[PDB]
Amino acid sequence: GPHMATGQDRVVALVDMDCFFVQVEQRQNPHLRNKPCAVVQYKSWKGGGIIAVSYEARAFGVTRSMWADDAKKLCPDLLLAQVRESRGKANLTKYREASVEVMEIMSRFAVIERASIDEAYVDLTSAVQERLQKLQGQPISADLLPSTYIEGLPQGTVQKEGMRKQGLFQWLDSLQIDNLTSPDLQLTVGAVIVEEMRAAIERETGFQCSAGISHNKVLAKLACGLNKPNRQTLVSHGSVPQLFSQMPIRKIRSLGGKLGASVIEILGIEYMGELTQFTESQLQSHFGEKNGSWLYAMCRGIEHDPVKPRQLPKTIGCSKNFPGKTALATREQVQWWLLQLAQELEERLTKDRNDNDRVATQLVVSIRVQGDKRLSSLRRCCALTRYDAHKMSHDAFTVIKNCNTSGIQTEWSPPLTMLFLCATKFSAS
DNA sequence: CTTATGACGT
DNA sequence: ACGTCATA
Ligand SMILES: Nc1nc2c(ncn2[C@H]2C[C@H](O)[C@@H](COP(=O)(O)NP(=O)(O)OP(=O)(O)O)O2)c(=O)[nH]1
Ligand SMILES: [Mg+2]
Ligand SMILES: [Mg+2]
Ligand code: NA
Numbered sequence: 001g002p003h004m005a006t007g008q009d010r011v012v013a014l015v016d017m018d019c020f021f022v023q024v025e026q027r028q029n030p031h032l033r034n035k036p037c038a039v040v041q042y043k044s045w046k047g048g049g050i051i052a053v054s055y056e057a058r059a060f061g062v063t064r065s066m067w068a069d070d071a072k073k074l075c076p077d078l079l080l081a082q083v084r085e086s087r088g089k090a091n092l093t094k095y096r097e098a099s100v101e102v103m104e105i106m107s108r109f110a111v112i113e114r115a116s117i118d119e120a121y122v123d124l125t126s127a128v129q130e131r132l133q134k135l136q137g138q139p140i141s142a143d144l145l146p147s148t149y150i151e152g153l154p155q156g157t158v159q160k161e162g163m164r165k166q167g168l169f170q171w172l173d174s175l176q177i178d179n180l181t182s183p184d185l186q187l188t189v190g191a192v193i194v195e196e197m198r199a200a201i202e203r204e205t206g207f208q209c210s211a212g213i214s215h216n217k218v219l220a221k222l223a224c225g226l227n228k229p230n231r232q233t234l235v236s237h238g239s240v241p242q243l244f245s246q247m248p249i250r251k252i253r254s255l256g257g258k259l260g261a262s263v264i265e266i267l268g269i270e271y272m273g274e275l276t277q278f279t280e281s282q283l284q285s286h287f288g289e290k291n292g293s294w295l296y297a298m299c300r301g302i303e304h305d306p307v308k309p310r311q312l313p314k315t316i317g318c319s320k321n322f323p324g325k326t327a328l329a330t331r332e333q334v335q336w337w338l339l340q341l342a343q344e345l346e347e348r349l350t351k352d353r354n355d356n357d358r359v360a361t362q363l364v365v366s367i368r369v370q371g372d373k374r375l376s377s378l379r380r381c382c383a384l385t386r387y388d389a390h391k392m393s394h395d396a397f398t399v400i401k402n403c404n405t406s407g408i409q410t411e412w413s414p415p416l417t418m419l420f421l422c423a424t425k426f427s428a429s
Numbered sequence: 430c431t432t433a434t435g436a437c438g439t
Numbered sequence: 440a441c442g443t444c445a446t447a
Contacts, residue, residue: 041431041432042430042431044430045430046430049430049431051431051432051447064447065431065447067430083431083432089432090431090432090433092432092433114434115434115435115446116433116434116435116446116447117433117434253445253446254436254444254445254446255445256445256446257444257445257446258444258445259444259445290437313434313435314434314435315433315434315435317432317433317434318432318433319431319432319433320431320432321430321431321432322430323430323431324430325430326430374442374443375443375444376441376442376443378441378442379440379441379442380440380441381440381441417430418431420432420433422433422434
């Protein structure tokens with residue numbers, strides 16, 4: 001009805017880099033450019049574990065979580081770059097730094113929420129209103145949207161760019177005619193700005209990215225993945241019913257795990273759109289008040305989670321798995337690795353303080369023990385009063401030492417399969 | 430045979 | 440404070 005909210009109050013973008021770590025490595029080594037390429041961690045065991053894959057390499061079926069030795073079977077010519085290894089562990093510093101390059105460019109256009117090392121949300125609502133005033137009812141040319149897809153169009157040509165343009169033309173013709181709503185116009189100007197943002201990013205870093213533009217974070221994120229790489233996608237409120245009608249529930253953010261599986265199992269459905277049939281109370285009874293409320297609105301393309309003004313990460317941490325045989329079975333060994341972890345952390349904390357005028361005040365220590373399915377066996381915290389690796393490693397050991405079942409002080413049992421140090425609770429410096 | 434992040438429940 | 444989930 002007239003009083004019914006449609007969740008069209010905001011313009012939100014999600015900008016996500018294509019094959020991020022690969023591009024960073026490609027920029028540094030031109031030999032890797034425009035080639036089937038992947039980035040791995042370590043190399044001894046099975047060639048190393050792949051965590052990023054160029055789109056050339058993806059065409060051969062290489063994916064994330066694949067051992068490099070196995071990827072080579074699919075793609076014999078696969079080029080590999082290795083994550084920096086420091087103090088016996090993976091060091092992601094280059095990418096965190098590359099991340100900052102991108103975040104800083106994005107932050108010139110609008111307030112951003114860093115969502116991961118390679119992506120951020122953008123609230124473009126104010127920016128759109130400002131650009132709209134500047135444009136005096138002056139129509140929007142397709143030249144202003146050279147990489148934009150309008151999801152759901154065309155409707156009513158053989159090549160992809162041909163279909164992109166026709167859908168875009170159909171969309172633009174419906175704004176200029178007055179067939180579309182003002183939210184639609186707002187989304188379009190938002191997409192214009194994102195084109196500019198993405199141009200600035202590539203010019204100034206050499207990195208390409210994709211983007212989604214919509215009315216909320218979830219639709220923005222979903223939209224971004226629709227036309228990767230090097231393209232942006234506008235998902236309108238109107239496109240939602242068709243989009244969601246065959247959209248598997250697991251594809252929506254936060255529903256890719258257990259909750260999503262329970263939604264599918266309990267309700268006996270498969271697609272996001274099928275959720276509209278249930279009342280809010282019904283959804284609440286099965287999945288709780290909060291989730292139920294979120295699911296009722298989300299299946300209608302409505303989501304209110306704000307873009308938090310947070311450009312920097314809330315936490316600074318590092319970890320290392322010691323699986324199977326490599327599990328840490330002595331006290332001396334556990335302490336040595338706590339020191340390696342603490343040294344990297346201290347290095348990152350020190351730079352963080354100089355860069356961002358803040359200090360962590362709490363240190364979180366997490367371990368995993370052999371034979372435990374759970375990712376984390378035990379979590380403990382202590383005060384973080386000094387940026388000193390020796391103290392931090394020593395304190396971390398103090399808070400976890402009790403775990404040691406072994407009767408001998410010299411040996412550690414059950415052996416440790418993971419160590420994790422996280423600096424948290426920042427305050428102004 | 431990974432290394433991170435953020436959010437939420439109790 | 441601690442554990443769990445979700446992301447990738
Ligand atoms: N250490 C570690 N780094 C990872 C892992 N998974 C991903 N990364 C790193 C490597 C990734 O480059 C980066 C960004 O994550 P995505 O955006 O999910 N993948 P990409 O940007 O590669 O491709 P596209 O977005 O176009 O699909 O984070 C992991 O399990 N562990
Ligand atoms: Mg990416
Ligand atoms: Mg990403
Ligand atoms: Na090359």
